[PDB]
Amino acid sequence: TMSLGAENSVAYSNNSIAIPTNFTISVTTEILPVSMTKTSVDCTMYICGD
Amino acid sequence: CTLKSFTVEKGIYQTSNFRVQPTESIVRFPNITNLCPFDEVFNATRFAS
Ligand SMILES: *[C@@H]1O[C@H](CO)[C@@H](O)[C@H](O)[C@H]1NC(C)=O
Ligand SMILES: *[C@@H]1O[C@H](CO)[C@@H](O)[C@H](O)[C@H]1NC(C)=O
């Protein structure tokens, strides 16, 4: 069976805040297509070749 | 003649493609074929009755 992840458990309260004391720069990536190949077709030489 | 009009506008147009004319007619066949020895029939010295 697929595991959705390590069951975590967050400890909510009503008088408790959790403030980070350190940070981290993190160069991610993202990849995107922009254009595809530019084809063309001539009817007479495809259907009726010679 | 490809736009079927009389005016054309500033641009590039993909007309027909060019291919030089195929004119002649070639019929090549293996010359390995040999003549059947019918000479033995027609040039036979004596025919049957
Ligand atoms: C937090 O919640 C509990 C449960 O209702 C309550 O008794 C308590 O008074 C709350 N905290 C404050 C600061 O009111
Ligand atoms: C913050 O984190 C970096 C590495 O993650 C560490 O070198 C640095 O000492 C940390 N600073 C503090 C104040 O914890």
PDB file of C-alpha atoms and ligand atoms in Angstrom:
ATOM      1  CA  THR A   1       0.000   0.000   0.000  1.00  0.00           C
ATOM      2  CA  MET A   2       1.301   3.522  -0.850  1.00  0.00           C
ATOM      3  CA  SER A   3       2.722   5.303   2.246  1.00  0.00           C
ATOM      4  CA  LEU A   4       1.509   8.921   2.305  1.00  0.00           C
ATOM      5  CA  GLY A   5       4.446   9.846   4.537  1.00  0.00           C
ATOM      6  CA  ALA A   6       5.758   9.637   8.091  1.00  0.00           C
ATOM      7  CA  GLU A   7       2.671  10.380  10.231  1.00  0.00           C
ATOM      8  CA  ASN A   8       3.748  13.564  12.025  1.00  0.00           C
ATOM      9  CA  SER A   9       1.922  15.047  15.003  1.00  0.00           C
ATOM     10  CA  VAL A  10       1.954  18.780  15.738  1.00  0.00           C
ATOM     11  CA  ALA A  11       1.534  19.843  19.356  1.00  0.00           C
ATOM     12  CA  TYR A  12      -0.944  22.697  19.295  1.00  0.00           C
ATOM     13  CA  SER A  13      -1.465  24.793  22.399  1.00  0.00           C
ATOM     14  CA  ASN A  14      -3.004  28.155  23.204  1.00  0.00           C
ATOM     15  CA  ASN A  15      -0.010  29.842  24.817  1.00  0.00           C
ATOM     16  CA  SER A  16       2.888  28.457  22.800  1.00  0.00           C
ATOM     17  CA  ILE A  17       4.638  29.960  19.777  1.00  0.00           C
ATOM     18  CA  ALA A  18       7.525  28.345  17.887  1.00  0.00           C
ATOM     19  CA  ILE A  19       9.872  30.916  16.328  1.00  0.00           C
ATOM     20  CA  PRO A  20      12.769  29.801  14.082  1.00  0.00           C
ATOM     21  CA  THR A  21      16.211  30.934  15.227  1.00  0.00           C
ATOM     22  CA  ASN A  22      18.173  30.149  12.046  1.00  0.00           C
ATOM     23  CA  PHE A  23      17.515  30.070   8.298  1.00  0.00           C
ATOM     24  CA  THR A  24      18.790  28.548   5.073  1.00  0.00           C
ATOM     25  CA  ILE A  25      19.173  29.734   1.494  1.00  0.00           C
ATOM     26  CA  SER A  26      17.939  27.091  -0.908  1.00  0.00           C
ATOM     27  CA  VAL A  27      18.349  27.382  -4.671  1.00  0.00           C
ATOM     28  CA  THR A  28      15.612  25.170  -6.054  1.00  0.00           C
ATOM     29  CA  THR A  29      14.902  24.516  -9.722  1.00  0.00           C
ATOM     30  CA  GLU A  30      11.939  24.651 -12.068  1.00  0.00           C
ATOM     31  CA  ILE A  31      11.818  23.428 -15.648  1.00  0.00           C
ATOM     32  CA  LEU A  32       9.318  24.627 -18.224  1.00  0.00           C
ATOM     33  CA  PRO A  33       8.872  23.929 -21.929  1.00  0.00           C
ATOM     34  CA  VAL A  34       8.320  27.054 -24.010  1.00  0.00           C
ATOM     35  CA  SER A  35       8.179  26.031 -27.662  1.00  0.00           C
ATOM     36  CA  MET A  36       7.894  22.783 -29.581  1.00  0.00           C
ATOM     37  CA  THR A  37       9.221  21.809 -32.986  1.00  0.00           C
ATOM     38  CA  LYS A  38       7.864  23.763 -35.946  1.00  0.00           C
ATOM     39  CA  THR A  39       6.794  21.249 -38.572  1.00  0.00           C
ATOM     40  CA  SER A  40       5.246  21.694 -42.016  1.00  0.00           C
ATOM     41  CA  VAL A  41       3.655  19.445 -44.628  1.00  0.00           C
ATOM     42  CA  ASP A  42       3.093  19.545 -48.389  1.00  0.00           C
ATOM     43  CA  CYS A  43      -0.013  17.619 -49.409  1.00  0.00           C
ATOM     44  CA  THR A  44       0.950  16.549 -52.911  1.00  0.00           C
ATOM     45  CA  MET A  45       4.248  14.934 -51.921  1.00  0.00           C
ATOM     46  CA  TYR A  46       2.845  13.223 -48.843  1.00  0.00           C
ATOM     47  CA  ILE A  47      -0.356  11.742 -50.269  1.00  0.00           C
ATOM     48  CA  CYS A  48       0.498  11.667 -53.984  1.00  0.00           C
ATOM     49  CA  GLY A  49       4.265  11.157 -53.841  1.00  0.00           C
ATOM     50  CA  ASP A  50       5.520  11.254 -57.443  1.00  0.00           C
TER      51      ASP A  50
ATOM     52  CA  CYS B   1      -1.811  30.782 -57.456  1.00  0.00           C
ATOM     53  CA  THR B   2      -1.447  29.157 -54.029  1.00  0.00           C
ATOM     54  CA  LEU B   3      -3.247  31.918 -52.128  1.00  0.00           C
ATOM     55  CA  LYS B   4      -5.851  32.043 -54.929  1.00  0.00           C
ATOM     56  CA  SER B   5      -5.835  35.827 -54.990  1.00  0.00           C
ATOM     57  CA  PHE B   6      -4.303  38.733 -56.880  1.00  0.00           C
ATOM     58  CA  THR B   7      -2.645  40.735 -54.101  1.00  0.00           C
ATOM     59  CA  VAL B   8      -0.125  39.385 -51.616  1.00  0.00           C
ATOM     60  CA  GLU B   9       1.124  40.981 -48.421  1.00  0.00           C
ATOM     61  CA  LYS B  10       4.558  41.529 -46.918  1.00  0.00           C
ATOM     62  CA  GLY B  11       5.667  38.107 -45.734  1.00  0.00           C
ATOM     63  CA  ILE B  12       6.998  34.675 -46.701  1.00  0.00           C
ATOM     64  CA  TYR B  13       4.568  32.137 -48.202  1.00  0.00           C
ATOM     65  CA  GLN B  14       5.073  28.385 -48.487  1.00  0.00           C
ATOM     66  CA  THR B  15       4.004  27.717 -52.065  1.00  0.00           C
ATOM     67  CA  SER B  16       4.359  24.344 -53.734  1.00  0.00           C
ATOM     68  CA  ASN B  17       7.674  22.496 -53.470  1.00  0.00           C
ATOM     69  CA  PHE B  18       9.943  22.149 -56.543  1.00  0.00           C
ATOM     70  CA  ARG B  19      10.926  18.736 -57.982  1.00  0.00           C
ATOM     71  CA  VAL B  20      12.320  18.376 -61.514  1.00  0.00           C
ATOM     72  CA  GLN B  21      10.112  16.432 -63.908  1.00  0.00           C
ATOM     73  CA  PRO B  22      10.469  12.623 -64.129  1.00  0.00           C
ATOM     74  CA  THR B  23      10.208  12.076 -67.878  1.00  0.00           C
ATOM     75  CA  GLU B  24      11.570   8.822 -69.271  1.00  0.00           C
ATOM     76  CA  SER B  25      10.445   5.203 -68.905  1.00  0.00           C
ATOM     77  CA  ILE B  26      12.922   2.536 -67.785  1.00  0.00           C
ATOM     78  CA  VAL B  27      12.067  -1.164 -67.951  1.00  0.00           C
ATOM     79  CA  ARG B  28      15.165  -3.196 -67.034  1.00  0.00           C
ATOM     80  CA  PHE B  29      14.888  -7.022 -66.733  1.00  0.00           C
ATOM     81  CA  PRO B  30      17.632  -9.629 -65.937  1.00  0.00           C
ATOM     82  CA  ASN B  31      19.150 -10.608 -69.339  1.00  0.00           C
ATOM     83  CA  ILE B  32      20.120 -13.908 -67.592  1.00  0.00           C
ATOM     84  CA  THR B  33      16.974 -15.309 -69.315  1.00  0.00           C
ATOM     85  CA  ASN B  34      18.171 -17.657 -72.125  1.00  0.00           C
ATOM     86  CA  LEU B  35      16.336 -18.647 -75.327  1.00  0.00           C
ATOM     87  CA  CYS B  36      14.488 -21.924 -75.059  1.00  0.00           C
ATOM     88  CA  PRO B  37      16.087 -24.513 -77.380  1.00  0.00           C
ATOM     89  CA  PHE B  38      13.184 -24.638 -79.856  1.00  0.00           C
ATOM     90  CA  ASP B  39      15.799 -25.103 -82.603  1.00  0.00           C
ATOM     91  CA  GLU B  40      15.734 -28.804 -81.712  1.00  0.00           C
ATOM     92  CA  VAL B  41      12.064 -28.817 -82.750  1.00  0.00           C
ATOM     93  CA  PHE B  42      12.107 -26.647 -85.877  1.00  0.00           C
ATOM     94  CA  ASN B  43      15.549 -27.627 -87.213  1.00  0.00           C
ATOM     95  CA  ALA B  44      15.158 -31.324 -86.396  1.00  0.00           C
ATOM     96  CA  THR B  45      16.463 -33.553 -89.171  1.00  0.00           C
ATOM     97  CA  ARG B  46      13.363 -35.774 -89.302  1.00  0.00           C
ATOM     98  CA  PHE B  47       9.852 -35.117 -88.050  1.00  0.00           C
ATOM     99  CA  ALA B  48       7.562 -37.836 -86.770  1.00  0.00           C
ATOM    100  CA  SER B  49       4.621 -39.104 -88.776  1.00  0.00           C
TER     101      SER B  49
HETATM  102  C1  LIG C   1      -5.945  26.966  27.031  1.00  0.00           C
HETATM  103  O1  LIG C   1      -7.004  26.014  26.874  1.00  0.00           O
HETATM  104  C2  LIG C   1      -7.426  25.368  28.084  1.00  0.00           C
HETATM  105  C3  LIG C   1      -8.510  24.391  27.693  1.00  0.00           C
HETATM  106  O2  LIG C   1      -9.740  25.061  27.456  1.00  0.00           O
HETATM  107  C4  LIG C   1      -7.905  26.408  29.090  1.00  0.00           C
HETATM  108  O3  LIG C   1      -8.236  25.763  30.315  1.00  0.00           O
HETATM  109  C5  LIG C   1      -6.816  27.444  29.327  1.00  0.00           C
HETATM  110  O4  LIG C   1      -7.301  28.467  30.187  1.00  0.00           O
HETATM  111  C6  LIG C   1      -6.378  28.058  28.003  1.00  0.00           C
HETATM  112  N1  LIG C   1      -5.312  29.023  28.218  1.00  0.00           N
HETATM  113  C7  LIG C   1      -5.542  30.302  28.531  1.00  0.00           C
HETATM  114  C8  LIG C   1      -4.329  31.162  28.721  1.00  0.00           C
HETATM  115  O5  LIG C   1      -6.680  30.746  28.655  1.00  0.00           O
HETATM  116  C1  LIG C   2      22.932  28.805  11.669  1.00  0.00           C
HETATM  117  O1  LIG C   2      23.096  27.649  10.833  1.00  0.00           O
HETATM  118  C2  LIG C   2      24.383  27.545  10.204  1.00  0.00           C
HETATM  119  C3  LIG C   2      24.346  26.309   9.341  1.00  0.00           C
HETATM  120  O2  LIG C   2      23.010  25.891   9.106  1.00  0.00           O
HETATM  121  C4  LIG C   2      25.477  27.490  11.261  1.00  0.00           C
HETATM  122  O3  LIG C   2      26.749  27.459  10.626  1.00  0.00           O
HETATM  123  C5  LIG C   2      25.381  28.711  12.161  1.00  0.00           C
HETATM  124  O4  LIG C   2      26.346  28.617  13.200  1.00  0.00           O
HETATM  125  C6  LIG C   2      23.990  28.798  12.766  1.00  0.00           C
HETATM  126  N1  LIG C   2      23.875  29.970  13.616  1.00  0.00           N
HETATM  127  C7  LIG C   2      23.284  29.939  14.813  1.00  0.00           C
HETATM  128  C8  LIG C   2      23.250  31.234  15.565  1.00  0.00           C
HETATM  129  O5  LIG C   2      22.796  28.910  15.267  1.00  0.00           O
END
